[PDB]
Amino acid sequence: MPFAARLNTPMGPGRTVVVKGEVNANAKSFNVDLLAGKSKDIALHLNPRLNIKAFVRNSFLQESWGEEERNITSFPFSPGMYFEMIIYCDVREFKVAVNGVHSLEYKHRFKELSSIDTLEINGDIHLLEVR
C-alpha cells in the first residue's frame, strides 16, 4: 500500500465497506477514506490516531475541510493488534463499528451517496482484507 481501489458498487442506503487489518507495532496514525473519485471529495474520512488515542473524522468537500468530530466512547485501536472495521451506510448517517462494538455515527455531509465510488487506505497499518 497505499491502497486505492474502486468500490465495485457505489454507496447508498444499506451499503457496507469492511476493513480488516493490523495496526503496526510502532504505529502513529492511519486513514480510511470514502471518496467521490469524480470530484476528489472525501465524503468519509476515518483517521484513528494511535499516539494521542483519538478517533478523528471529517469531510473534505469543495477543496475545503469541514468541522471535526472526535467524540468517542472508547478507543478501539491498539498498536500491534488486528482490527475489523465495519462501515455501514444508512439514510441520514454512516454507522461505524470496530471489533464487534459500535464506535460512532457520522451524519452525511456529502449528500449524493451514489457518487461515492472510491476507497483509499494509507498509514501505519497492514491491510489484510477489503470487503
Side-chain angles (χ1 to χ4, degrees):
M1 49 161 275
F3 174 92
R6 203 97 186 325
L7 262 34
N8 49 335
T9 327
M11 298 302 275
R15 285 277 296 100
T16 238
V17 179
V18 177
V19 203
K20 294 174 202 183
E22 284 167 309
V23 25
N24 286 346
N26 58 338
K28 290 192 187 163
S29 177
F30 76 97
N31 301 249
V32 16
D33 293 344
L34 257 47
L35 280 288
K38 227 318 194 181
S39 50
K40 187 65 189 168
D41 294 322
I42 310 174
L44 226 201
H45 164 77
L46 287 332
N47 181 311
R49 304 204 124 247
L50 297 325
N51 46 216
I52 54 159
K53 277 168 267 200
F55 200 167
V56 170
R57 57 272 179 200
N58 208 312
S59 306
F60 187 76
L61 274 30
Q62 288 99 256
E63 295 156 74
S64 171
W65 280 108
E67 196 181 340
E68 155 201 54
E69 302 183 51
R70 281 173 164 253
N71 265 329
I72 49 107
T73 190
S74 64
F75 190 71
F77 303 91
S78 212
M81 291 209 79
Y82 164 93
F83 72 93
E84 184 187 44
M85 196 162 74
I86 310 104
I87 307 171
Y88 167 78
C89 179
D90 215 336
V91 267
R92 288 169 283 98
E93 71 271 317
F94 288 110
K95 310 187 173 148
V96 187
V98 180
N99 290 312
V101 185
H102 173 250
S103 205
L104 63 94
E105 267 170 41
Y106 188 90
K107 282 188 198 286
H108 290 126
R109 296 184 193 177
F110 195 82
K111 308 272 203 186
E112 51 276 43
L113 311 171
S114 86
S115 305
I116 312 163
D117 57 347
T118 301
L119 212 212
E120 284 178 8
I121 322 178
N122 54 79
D124 314 334
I125 192 202
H126 176 71
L127 187 68
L128 296 171
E129 185 176 292
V130 162
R131 209 200 201 83

mmCIF file of all heavy atoms in Angstrom, residues 13-52:
data_model
loop_
_atom_site.group_PDB
_atom_site.id
_atom_site.type_symbol
_atom_site.label_atom_id
_atom_site.label_comp_id
_atom_site.label_asym_id
_atom_site.label_seq_id
_atom_site.Cartn_x
_atom_site.Cartn_y
_atom_site.Cartn_z
ATOM 1 N N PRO A 13 -28.062 3.889 0.755
ATOM 2 C CA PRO A 13 -28.661 3.346 1.965
ATOM 3 C C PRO A 13 -28.580 1.820 1.976
ATOM 4 O O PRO A 13 -29.206 1.156 1.149
ATOM 5 C CB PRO A 13 -30.113 3.817 1.875
ATOM 6 C CG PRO A 13 -30.047 5.059 1.078
ATOM 7 C CD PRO A 13 -28.965 4.831 0.069
ATOM 8 N N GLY A 14 -27.775 1.286 2.891
ATOM 9 C CA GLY A 14 -27.653 -0.153 3.080
ATOM 10 C C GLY A 14 -26.372 -0.779 2.571
ATOM 11 O O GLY A 14 -26.194 -1.996 2.652
ATOM 12 N N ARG A 15 -25.479 0.052 2.049
ATOM 13 C CA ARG A 15 -24.201 -0.428 1.545
ATOM 14 C C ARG A 15 -23.137 -0.509 2.648
ATOM 15 O O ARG A 15 -23.159 0.258 3.616
ATOM 16 C CB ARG A 15 -23.735 0.429 0.368
ATOM 17 C CG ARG A 15 -24.495 0.157 -0.933
ATOM 18 C CD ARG A 15 -23.955 -1.053 -1.692
ATOM 19 N NE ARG A 15 -22.578 -0.846 -2.133
ATOM 20 C CZ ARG A 15 -21.501 -1.329 -1.515
ATOM 21 N NH1 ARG A 15 -21.616 -2.067 -0.421
ATOM 22 N NH2 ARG A 15 -20.296 -1.072 -1.991
ATOM 23 N N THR A 16 -22.213 -1.452 2.490
ATOM 24 C CA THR A 16 -21.230 -1.751 3.525
ATOM 25 C C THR A 16 -19.798 -1.720 2.968
ATOM 26 O O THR A 16 -19.561 -2.108 1.820
ATOM 27 C CB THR A 16 -21.572 -3.118 4.215
ATOM 28 O OG1 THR A 16 -21.744 -2.928 5.625
ATOM 29 C CG2 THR A 16 -20.527 -4.214 3.943
ATOM 30 N N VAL A 17 -18.860 -1.218 3.770
ATOM 31 C CA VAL A 17 -17.430 -1.362 3.474
ATOM 32 C C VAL A 17 -16.726 -1.938 4.698
ATOM 33 O O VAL A 17 -16.760 -1.336 5.778
ATOM 34 C CB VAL A 17 -16.758 -0.029 3.065
ATOM 35 C CG1 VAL A 17 -15.270 -0.235 2.800
ATOM 36 C CG2 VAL A 17 -17.433 0.559 1.836
ATOM 37 N N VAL A 18 -16.101 -3.104 4.533
ATOM 38 C CA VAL A 18 -15.420 -3.749 5.652
ATOM 39 C C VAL A 18 -13.907 -3.736 5.495
ATOM 40 O O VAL A 18 -13.360 -4.157 4.473
ATOM 41 C CB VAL A 18 -15.927 -5.183 5.914
ATOM 42 C CG1 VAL A 18 -15.139 -5.828 7.048
ATOM 43 C CG2 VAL A 18 -17.400 -5.162 6.264
ATOM 44 N N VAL A 19 -13.247 -3.235 6.533
ATOM 45 C CA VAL A 19 -11.801 -3.170 6.586
ATOM 46 C C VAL A 19 -11.297 -4.126 7.660
ATOM 47 O O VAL A 19 -11.702 -4.039 8.820
ATOM 48 C CB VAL A 19 -11.325 -1.752 6.924
ATOM 49 C CG1 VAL A 19 -9.899 -1.541 6.427
ATOM 50 C CG2 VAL A 19 -12.261 -0.723 6.318
ATOM 51 N N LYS A 20 -10.424 -5.043 7.256
ATOM 52 C CA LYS A 20 -9.757 -5.945 8.184
ATOM 53 C C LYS A 20 -8.260 -5.765 8.029
ATOM 54 O O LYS A 20 -7.743 -5.763 6.911
ATOM 55 C CB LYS A 20 -10.140 -7.397 7.903
ATOM 56 C CG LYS A 20 -11.596 -7.718 8.162
ATOM 57 C CD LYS A 20 -11.931 -9.132 7.734
ATOM 58 C CE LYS A 20 -13.417 -9.284 7.473
ATOM 59 N NZ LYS A 20 -13.756 -10.686 7.133
ATOM 60 N N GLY A 21 -7.565 -5.611 9.150
ATOM 61 C CA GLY A 21 -6.126 -5.393 9.112
ATOM 62 C C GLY A 21 -5.432 -5.338 10.454
ATOM 63 O O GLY A 21 -6.037 -5.585 11.492
ATOM 64 N N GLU A 22 -4.149 -4.998 10.412
ATOM 65 C CA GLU A 22 -3.294 -4.981 11.589
ATOM 66 C C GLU A 22 -2.595 -3.641 11.739
ATOM 67 O O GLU A 22 -1.761 -3.270 10.908
ATOM 68 C CB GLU A 22 -2.234 -6.070 11.469
ATOM 69 C CG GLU A 22 -2.728 -7.470 11.721
ATOM 70 C CD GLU A 22 -1.720 -8.507 11.280
ATOM 71 O OE1 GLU A 22 -1.248 -8.423 10.125
ATOM 72 O OE2 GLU A 22 -1.407 -9.412 12.084
ATOM 73 N N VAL A 23 -2.926 -2.913 12.799
ATOM 74 C CA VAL A 23 -2.253 -1.648 13.072
ATOM 75 C C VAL A 23 -0.817 -1.949 13.515
ATOM 76 O O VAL A 23 -0.600 -2.803 14.370
ATOM 77 C CB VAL A 23 -3.072 -0.713 14.046
ATOM 78 C CG1 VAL A 23 -4.019 -1.504 14.941
ATOM 79 C CG2 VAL A 23 -2.174 0.190 14.870
ATOM 80 N N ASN A 24 0.147 -1.277 12.887
ATOM 81 C CA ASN A 24 1.574 -1.530 13.098
ATOM 82 C C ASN A 24 2.041 -1.458 14.548
ATOM 83 O O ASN A 24 1.456 -0.750 15.363
ATOM 84 C CB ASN A 24 2.405 -0.567 12.252
ATOM 85 C CG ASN A 24 2.393 -0.917 10.774
ATOM 86 O OD1 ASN A 24 1.993 -2.011 10.378
ATOM 87 N ND2 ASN A 24 2.856 0.014 9.950
ATOM 88 N N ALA A 25 3.111 -2.189 14.854
ATOM 89 C CA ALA A 25 3.681 -2.237 16.205
ATOM 90 C C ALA A 25 4.128 -0.867 16.718
ATOM 91 O O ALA A 25 4.007 -0.582 17.907
ATOM 92 C CB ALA A 25 4.835 -3.231 16.264
ATOM 93 N N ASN A 26 4.632 -0.028 15.817
ATOM 94 C CA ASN A 26 5.108 1.309 16.167
ATOM 95 C C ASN A 26 4.244 2.429 15.570
ATOM 96 O O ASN A 26 4.700 3.563 15.405
ATOM 97 C CB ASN A 26 6.568 1.469 15.731
ATOM 98 C CG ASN A 26 6.763 1.252 14.235
ATOM 99 O OD1 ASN A 26 5.943 0.612 13.573
ATOM 100 N ND2 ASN A 26 7.861 1.780 13.700
ATOM 101 N N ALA A 27 2.991 2.097 15.272
ATOM 102 C CA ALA A 27 2.078 2.985 14.555
ATOM 103 C C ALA A 27 1.790 4.308 15.258
ATOM 104 O O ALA A 27 1.788 4.382 16.488
ATOM 105 C CB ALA A 27 0.781 2.261 14.266
ATOM 106 N N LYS A 28 1.539 5.344 14.463
ATOM 107 C CA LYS A 28 1.099 6.634 14.985
ATOM 108 C C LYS A 28 -0.277 7.019 14.451
ATOM 109 O O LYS A 28 -1.102 7.555 15.190
ATOM 110 C CB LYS A 28 2.112 7.727 14.658
ATOM 111 C CG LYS A 28 3.417 7.601 15.419
ATOM 112 C CD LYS A 28 4.242 8.861 15.273
ATOM 113 C CE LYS A 28 5.619 8.689 15.871
ATOM 114 N NZ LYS A 28 6.549 9.748 15.380
ATOM 115 N N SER A 29 -0.517 6.741 13.170
ATOM 116 C CA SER A 29 -1.765 7.107 12.511
ATOM 117 C C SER A 29 -2.058 6.223 11.303
ATOM 118 O O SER A 29 -1.146 5.633 10.719
ATOM 119 C CB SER A 29 -1.712 8.571 12.068
ATOM 120 O OG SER A 29 -2.887 8.940 11.368
ATOM 121 N N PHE A 30 -3.340 6.131 10.946
ATOM 122 C CA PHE A 30 -3.756 5.620 9.635
ATOM 123 C C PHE A 30 -5.094 6.211 9.177
ATOM 124 O O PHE A 30 -5.819 6.809 9.971
ATOM 125 C CB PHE A 30 -3.736 4.084 9.578
ATOM 126 C CG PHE A 30 -4.881 3.411 10.291
ATOM 127 C CD1 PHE A 30 -6.005 2.991 9.585
ATOM 128 C CD2 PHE A 30 -4.816 3.149 11.655
ATOM 129 C CE1 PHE A 30 -7.052 2.348 10.230
ATOM 130 C CE2 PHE A 30 -5.861 2.504 12.310
ATOM 131 C CZ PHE A 30 -6.975 2.104 11.596
ATOM 132 N N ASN A 31 -5.394 6.065 7.888
ATOM 133 C CA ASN A 31 -6.588 6.654 7.288
ATOM 134 C C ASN A 31 -7.343 5.673 6.413
ATOM 135 O O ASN A 31 -6.736 4.938 5.638
ATOM 136 C CB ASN A 31 -6.219 7.850 6.405
ATOM 137 C CG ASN A 31 -5.508 8.949 7.160
ATOM 138 O OD1 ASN A 31 -6.063 10.029 7.361
ATOM 139 N ND2 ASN A 31 -4.263 8.691 7.565
ATOM 140 N N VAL A 32 -8.667 5.670 6.533
ATOM 141 C CA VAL A 32 -9.529 5.073 5.514
ATOM 142 C C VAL A 32 -10.525 6.129 5.043
ATOM 143 O O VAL A 32 -11.268 6.702 5.847
ATOM 144 C CB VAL A 32 -10.197 3.716 5.951
ATOM 145 C CG1 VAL A 32 -10.114 3.504 7.447
ATOM 146 C CG2 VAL A 32 -11.640 3.589 5.446
ATOM 147 N N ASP A 33 -10.495 6.403 3.741
ATOM 148 C CA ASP A 33 -11.328 7.434 3.134
ATOM 149 C C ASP A 33 -12.351 6.830 2.172
ATOM 150 O O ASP A 33 -12.042 5.887 1.440
ATOM 151 C CB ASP A 33 -10.461 8.449 2.373
ATOM 152 C CG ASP A 33 -9.568 9.289 3.284
ATOM 153 O OD1 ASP A 33 -9.809 9.335 4.511
ATOM 154 O OD2 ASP A 33 -8.619 9.920 2.759
ATOM 155 N N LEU A 34 -13.565 7.382 2.186
ATOM 156 C CA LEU A 34 -14.598 7.075 1.192
ATOM 157 C C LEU A 34 -14.745 8.246 0.223
ATOM 158 O O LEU A 34 -15.271 9.298 0.587
ATOM 159 C CB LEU A 34 -15.932 6.769 1.872
ATOM 160 C CG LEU A 34 -16.399 5.316 1.990
ATOM 161 C CD1 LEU A 34 -15.308 4.381 2.483
ATOM 162 C CD2 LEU A 34 -17.607 5.245 2.898
ATOM 163 N N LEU A 35 -14.279 8.045 -1.007
ATOM 164 C CA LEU A 35 -14.111 9.121 -1.989
ATOM 165 C C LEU A 35 -15.233 9.201 -3.014
ATOM 166 O O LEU A 35 -15.810 8.180 -3.402
ATOM 167 C CB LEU A 35 -12.807 8.921 -2.778
ATOM 168 C CG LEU A 35 -11.391 9.286 -2.324
ATOM 169 C CD1 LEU A 35 -11.176 10.792 -2.313
ATOM 170 C CD2 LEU A 35 -11.043 8.656 -0.991
ATOM 171 N N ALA A 36 -15.517 10.420 -3.461
ATOM 172 C CA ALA A 36 -16.266 10.636 -4.689
ATOM 173 C C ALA A 36 -15.231 10.951 -5.764
ATOM 174 O O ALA A 36 -14.977 12.118 -6.083
ATOM 175 C CB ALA A 36 -17.258 11.774 -4.530
ATOM 176 N N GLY A 37 -14.628 9.891 -6.303
ATOM 177 C CA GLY A 37 -13.484 9.990 -7.212
ATOM 178 C C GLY A 37 -13.592 11.032 -8.307
ATOM 179 O O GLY A 37 -12.578 11.550 -8.772
ATOM 180 N N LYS A 38 -14.823 11.345 -8.705
ATOM 181 C CA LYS A 38 -15.077 12.283 -9.796
ATOM 182 C C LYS A 38 -14.718 13.732 -9.436
ATOM 183 O O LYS A 38 -14.181 14.464 -10.270
ATOM 184 C CB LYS A 38 -16.534 12.189 -10.256
ATOM 185 C CG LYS A 38 -16.720 12.095 -11.778
ATOM 186 C CD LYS A 38 -15.797 13.052 -12.553
ATOM 187 C CE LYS A 38 -16.215 13.210 -14.006
ATOM 188 N NZ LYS A 38 -15.269 14.118 -14.710
ATOM 189 N N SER A 39 -15.014 14.136 -8.201
ATOM 190 C CA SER A 39 -14.700 15.487 -7.726
ATOM 191 C C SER A 39 -13.562 15.499 -6.702
ATOM 192 O O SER A 39 -13.174 16.563 -6.209
ATOM 193 C CB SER A 39 -15.948 16.154 -7.142
ATOM 194 O OG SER A 39 -16.584 15.307 -6.198
ATOM 195 N N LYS A 40 -13.035 14.310 -6.399
ATOM 196 C CA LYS A 40 -11.964 14.112 -5.404
ATOM 197 C C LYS A 40 -12.420 14.459 -3.978
ATOM 198 O O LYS A 40 -11.596 14.677 -3.088
ATOM 199 C CB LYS A 40 -10.680 14.872 -5.810
ATOM 200 C CG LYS A 40 -9.431 14.612 -4.947
ATOM 201 C CD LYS A 40 -8.918 13.167 -5.047
ATOM 202 C CE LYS A 40 -7.820 12.904 -4.007
ATOM 203 N NZ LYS A 40 -7.487 11.450 -3.856
ATOM 204 N N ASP A 41 -13.735 14.498 -3.768
ATOM 205 C CA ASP A 41 -14.301 14.782 -2.453
ATOM 206 C C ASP A 41 -14.140 13.562 -1.560
ATOM 207 O O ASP A 41 -14.384 12.435 -1.987
ATOM 208 C CB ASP A 41 -15.790 15.152 -2.544
ATOM 209 C CG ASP A 41 -16.038 16.468 -3.271
ATOM 210 O OD1 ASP A 41 -15.254 17.429 -3.107
ATOM 211 O OD2 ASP A 41 -17.047 16.544 -3.998
ATOM 212 N N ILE A 42 -13.710 13.786 -0.328
ATOM 213 C CA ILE A 42 -13.686 12.720 0.650
ATOM 214 C C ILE A 42 -14.926 12.909 1.503
ATOM 215 O O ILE A 42 -14.974 13.797 2.353
ATOM 216 C CB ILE A 42 -12.409 12.741 1.512
ATOM 217 C CG1 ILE A 42 -11.163 12.842 0.619
ATOM 218 C CG2 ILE A 42 -12.356 11.502 2.401
ATOM 219 C CD1 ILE A 42 -9.845 13.014 1.364
ATOM 220 N N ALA A 43 -15.939 12.092 1.234
ATOM 221 C CA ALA A 43 -17.199 12.126 1.968
ATOM 222 C C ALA A 43 -17.006 11.628 3.398
ATOM 223 O O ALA A 43 -17.505 12.234 4.345
ATOM 224 C CB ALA A 43 -18.247 11.294 1.247
ATOM 225 N N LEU A 44 -16.277 10.523 3.541
ATOM 226 C CA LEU A 44 -15.970 9.962 4.847
ATOM 227 C C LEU A 44 -14.470 9.785 4.986
ATOM 228 O O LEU A 44 -13.837 9.114 4.172
ATOM 229 C CB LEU A 44 -16.659 8.614 5.043
ATOM 230 C CG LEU A 44 -17.388 8.316 6.359
ATOM 231 C CD1 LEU A 44 -17.532 6.816 6.519
ATOM 232 C CD2 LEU A 44 -16.736 8.925 7.596
ATOM 233 N N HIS A 45 -13.923 10.390 6.036
ATOM 234 C CA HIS A 45 -12.504 10.331 6.339
ATOM 235 C C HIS A 45 -12.323 9.867 7.781
ATOM 236 O O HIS A 45 -12.417 10.659 8.708
ATOM 237 C CB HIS A 45 -11.881 11.707 6.095
ATOM 238 C CG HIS A 45 -10.528 11.891 6.705
ATOM 239 N ND1 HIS A 45 -9.383 11.353 6.159
ATOM 240 C CD2 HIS A 45 -10.133 12.580 7.801
ATOM 241 C CE1 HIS A 45 -8.344 11.692 6.899
ATOM 242 N NE2 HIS A 45 -8.772 12.435 7.903
ATOM 243 N N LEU A 46 -12.103 8.567 7.957
ATOM 244 C CA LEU A 46 -11.826 7.998 9.277
ATOM 245 C C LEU A 46 -10.325 7.973 9.543
ATOM 246 O O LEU A 46 -9.572 7.342 8.797
ATOM 247 C CB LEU A 46 -12.383 6.573 9.393
ATOM 248 C CG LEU A 46 -13.880 6.250 9.520
ATOM 249 C CD1 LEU A 46 -14.686 7.372 10.173
ATOM 250 C CD2 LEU A 46 -14.467 5.882 8.175
ATOM 251 N N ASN A 47 -9.893 8.646 10.605
ATOM 252 C CA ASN A 47 -8.468 8.740 10.924
ATOM 253 C C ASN A 47 -8.175 8.404 12.391
ATOM 254 O O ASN A 47 -8.175 9.292 13.243
ATOM 255 C CB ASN A 47 -7.948 10.135 10.557
ATOM 256 C CG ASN A 47 -6.463 10.309 10.826
ATOM 257 O OD1 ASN A 47 -5.965 9.989 11.906
ATOM 258 N ND2 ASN A 47 -5.753 10.851 9.847
ATOM 259 N N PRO A 48 -7.950 7.114 12.694
ATOM 260 C CA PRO A 48 -7.534 6.718 14.044
ATOM 261 C C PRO A 48 -6.088 7.113 14.359
ATOM 262 O O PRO A 48 -5.176 6.811 13.590
ATOM 263 C CB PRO A 48 -7.694 5.196 14.029
ATOM 264 C CG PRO A 48 -8.677 4.927 12.934
ATOM 265 C CD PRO A 48 -8.380 5.952 11.892
ATOM 266 N N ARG A 49 -5.900 7.786 15.489
ATOM 267 C CA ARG A 49 -4.605 8.333 15.870
ATOM 268 C C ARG A 49 -4.098 7.650 17.122
ATOM 269 O O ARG A 49 -4.484 8.007 18.234
ATOM 270 C CB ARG A 49 -4.713 9.836 16.107
ATOM 271 C CG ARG A 49 -5.263 10.580 14.928
ATOM 272 C CD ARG A 49 -4.851 12.024 14.930
ATOM 273 N NE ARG A 49 -4.190 12.327 13.671
ATOM 274 C CZ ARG A 49 -2.905 12.631 13.558
ATOM 275 N NH1 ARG A 49 -2.135 12.717 14.632
ATOM 276 N NH2 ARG A 49 -2.389 12.870 12.365
ATOM 277 N N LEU A 50 -3.216 6.677 16.924
ATOM 278 C CA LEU A 50 -2.768 5.783 17.988
ATOM 279 C C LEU A 50 -1.998 6.474 19.111
ATOM 280 O O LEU A 50 -2.115 6.078 20.270
ATOM 281 C CB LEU A 50 -1.932 4.632 17.410
ATOM 282 C CG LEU A 50 -2.563 3.630 16.429
ATOM 283 C CD1 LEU A 50 -4.024 3.358 16.750
ATOM 284 C CD2 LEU A 50 -2.424 4.090 14.988
ATOM 285 N N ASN A 51 -1.221 7.499 18.764
ATOM 286 C CA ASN A 51 -0.356 8.168 19.741
ATOM 287 C C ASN A 51 -1.094 9.018 20.762
ATOM 288 O O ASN A 51 -0.789 8.969 21.949
ATOM 289 C CB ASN A 51 0.782 8.963 19.073
ATOM 290 C CG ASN A 51 0.319 9.825 17.903
ATOM 291 O OD1 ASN A 51 1.043 9.967 16.918
ATOM 292 N ND2 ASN A 51 -0.865 10.416 18.010
ATOM 293 N N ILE A 52 -2.069 9.788 20.295
ATOM 294 C CA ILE A 52 -2.878 10.620 21.174
ATOM 295 C C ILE A 52 -4.147 9.883 21.590
ATOM 296 O O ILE A 52 -4.872 10.330 22.480
ATOM 297 C CB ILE A 52 -3.226 11.986 20.529
ATOM 298 C CG1 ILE A 52 -3.893 11.796 19.159
ATOM 299 C CG2 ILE A 52 -1.973 12.852 20.416
ATOM 300 C CD1 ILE A 52 -4.696 12.998 18.685
#
